């Protein structure tokens, strides 16, 4: 890959630094997601308080309290109708996002999914009606919105799965899995059959994302050794590591070009890497504590961080 | 008291020696 990649002209200087700050939480922050409106903010905490900001404005337009602790995964509706927050209470509630009832954002709690263990993440599939979820069960499924009516199951695993992301393509609504077993496996939701798996890492794996052309996906874990994997060749493509960084790798997400690579780490920095030439390009020291999880806005204009410093920033 | 004290002393001594 890079033996041919050296041909493409290398890339120049970056000057990205802060452009906002959020000061509302009262604990660590441990999940965040963009809307499709390309400007709002969703992020849940570990102390029972979910937030909905406007980083463009820093002005709260919602608020909500979850009954439990360690709210470890949130998600935003495509249109902006509902958000799914849950984990460690085994049940993933969903609230109607809109300005519908000025009484509460939690009062319309309607149980939709519920496993028997802590719940890792969730992502909407395509339509405001069907959400994924993952727990320590080692088994995921699709759960309808109003019903709680399970729709299919995947039991190919034996550990705690932690990863889940849609495909970009609207061709075959598939999705991806890799967990404590040191492996990654991808479900085909049309059946529920584990058609393809992957394993090279050295420990548990803490998130993954698709190459945004719908053709591959890389990742990083607490090995600190990020890797990128193809679907068509079925092979590792290039190692992503550096002896300097040693700590754990706690998120990844691509840039709309599909050029860069992002990853929040455990040594408190962030680390943008070239996807082809394999060099680092910056380390943008902002967070007094560890990086929780990280995302790119879908428009393609910036990215935020999840971190252990009790606040968020909007890194441009 | 004396027995407990002597035991504690010799034990802390043996511990600090095992640590050395």
């Amino acid at each position: 890959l890079h033996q041919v990649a050296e041909r493409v002209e290398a890339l120049g200087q970056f000057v990205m630094k802060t452009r906002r700050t959020l000061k509302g939480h009262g604990n660590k922050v441990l999940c965040m997601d963009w809307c499709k409106d390309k400007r709002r903010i969703v992020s849940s905490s570990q102390d029972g308080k979910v937030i909905v900001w406007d980083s463009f404005t820093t002005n709260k337009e919602h608020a909500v309290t979850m009954p439990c602790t360690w709210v470890m995964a949130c998600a935003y509706a495509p249109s902006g109708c509902a958000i799914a927050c849950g984990g460690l209470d085994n049940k993933c509630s969903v609230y109607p996002l809109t300005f519908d009832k000025n009484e509460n954002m939690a009062a319309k709690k309607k149980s939709v999914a519920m496993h028997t263990n802590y719940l890792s993440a969730c992502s909407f599939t395509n339509s405001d009606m069907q959400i994924l979820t993952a727990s320590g069960d080692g088994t995921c499924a699709l759960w309808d919105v109003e019903s709680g009516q399970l729709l299919q199951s995947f039991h190919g695993h034996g550990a705690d799965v932690l990863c889940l992301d849609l495909a970009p393509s609207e061709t075959g609504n598939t999705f991806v899995s890799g967990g404590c077993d040191k492996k990654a496996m991808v479900w085909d939701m049309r059946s529920g059959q584990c058609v393809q798996a992957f394993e090279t890492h050295e420990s548990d794996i803490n998130s993954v994302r698709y190459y945004p052309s719908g053709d591959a996906f890389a990742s990083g874990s607490d090995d600190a050794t990020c890797r990128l994997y193809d679907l068509r060749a079925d092979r590792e493509v290039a190692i992503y590591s550096k002896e300097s960084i040693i700590f754990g790798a706690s998120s990844v997400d691509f840039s709309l070009s599909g050029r860069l690579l992002f990853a929040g780490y455990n040594d408190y920095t962030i680390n943008v890497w070239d996807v082809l030439k394999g060099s680092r390009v910056s380390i943008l020291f902002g967070h007094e504590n560890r990086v929780s999880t990280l995302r790119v806005s879908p428009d393609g204009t910036a990215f935020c961080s999840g971190s252990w410093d009790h606040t968020l920033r909007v890194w441009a | 008291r004396c027995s407990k004290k002597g035991l504690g002393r010799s034990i802390m001594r043996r511990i600090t020696e095992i640590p050395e």
Binding site: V8, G300, A302 | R13
Partner: protein, 381 residues
């Protein structure tokens, strides 16, 4: 266990750090006030990092050093709060019995023991800071029964260590001071102990082919990347504008938009604008059905299980029932699959038929559309 490997790597680090032939030399300073041995200055460790690790940014190497020193692998001799500061201050490594890798866990009675011992070694001053005096006050108020043998073993230890030579008492008390800094730190700096509850337990093609595909998929939007090289310099984040997204709102596309449509009809259908203009051409060409079907399939794949049957039979009777106006066109196995599944509304009901019509449209419609006069006239301006 995950973090174990992390501590192992940093153990590799410090092991290379106090190397026999290379390494930092642990010096003995001489002062007008005293003669202190077995220390060194933070500039030394900074230099050592930069040499043997090739950490280009002084700041980056300093941050690595910062968190290492906040995991108890070296400390500043005169401070509670672990922070490596590049200057002339005196440091020290830690003892293999007091790393943090050894699963250690102090508890409240033992904090009381260390409090009584420190407060009773010297009796010249309250040799302590206000937070630790505060902690001892609480320990007093809550440990009403159990104090005595605490005091006992404390002064016992004091004798057992002072009996050894004067520099020995100093270095041992320094080490077994700092190792309780790290495991019960000052109010401000973050603890470096905790962990998250989660860890609280076949056709293939050549890589060169994938290389071309990946490079090309980069290039075709490479000039669209709003991080690397954006032609629209309007950045609502950076340059306090709103116009970029607002133009993104309007149905009139950008010439960027129209050039971007020309790559693949899939991206077109992703675009609502593209859907509208493609549908307009299909209508004016009297060819607005297959797109109508495929949109029908997709809009069906969105509703819950309450309407799946209500639509599947209806959509059959409208398109896939022979004798209806909208005449979707199937082959043998396609119409066989359709007839068998149509009894049972399914989340993947019309897969093969959708594949058939979809390859049809992708093979025929999109080409002539991009070749079409409307496309050219709209892309010109």
């Amino acid at each position: 266990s995950p973090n174990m490997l992390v501590y192992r790597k940093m153990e590799d680090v410090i092991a290379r750090m106090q190397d026999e032939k290379n390494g930092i030399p642990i010096r003995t300073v001489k002062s007008f006030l005293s003669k202190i041995p077995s220390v060194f200055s933070g500039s030394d460790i900074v230099q050592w990092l930069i040499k043997n690790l090739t950490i280009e940014d002084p700041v980056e190497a300093l941050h690595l050093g910062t968190l290492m020193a906040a995991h108890g692998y070296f400390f500043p001799i005169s401070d509670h709060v672990l922070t490596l500061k590049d200057d002339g201050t005196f440091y020290r490594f830690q003892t293999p019995y007091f790393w943090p890798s050894n699963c250690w866990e102090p508890e409240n009675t033992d904090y009381a023991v260390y409090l009584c011992k420190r407060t009773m070694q010297n009796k010249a001053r309250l040799e302590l800071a206000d937070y630790e005096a505060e902690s001892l006050a609480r320990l007093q108020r809550a440990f009403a029964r159990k104090w005595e043998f605490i005091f006992m073993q404390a002064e016992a230890q004091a004798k057992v260590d002072k009996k050894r030579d004067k520099i020995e008492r100093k270095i041992l008390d320094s080490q077994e001071r700092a190792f309780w800094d790290v495991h019960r730190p000052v109010p401000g700096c973050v603890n470096t102990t905790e962990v998250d509850i989660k860890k609280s337990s076949r056709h293939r093609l050549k890589m060169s082919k994938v290389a071309d595909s990946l490079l090309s998929y980069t290039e075709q939007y490479l000039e669209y990347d709003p991080f690397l090289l954006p032609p629209d310099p309007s950045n609502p984040w950076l340059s306090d504008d709103t116009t970029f997204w607002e133009l993104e709102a309007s149905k009139e596309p950008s010439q960027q938009r129209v050039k971007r449509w020309g790559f693949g009809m899939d991206e077109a259908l992703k675009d609502p604008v593209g859907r509208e203009q493609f549908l307009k051409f299909l209508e004016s060409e009297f060819s607005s059905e297959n797109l109508r079907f495929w949109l029908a399939v997709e809009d069906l794949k969105k509703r819950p299980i309450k309407e799946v049957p209500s639509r599947v039979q209806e959509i059959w009777q409208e398109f896939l029932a022979p004798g209806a106006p909208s005449a979707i066109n199937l082959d043998s196995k396609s119409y066989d699959k359709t007839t068998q599944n149509v009894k049972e509304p399914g989340r993947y009901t019309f897969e093969d038929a959708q594949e058939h019509i979809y390859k049809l449209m992708k093979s025929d419609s999109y080409p002539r559309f991009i070749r079409s006069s409307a496309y050219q006239e709209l892309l010109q301006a």
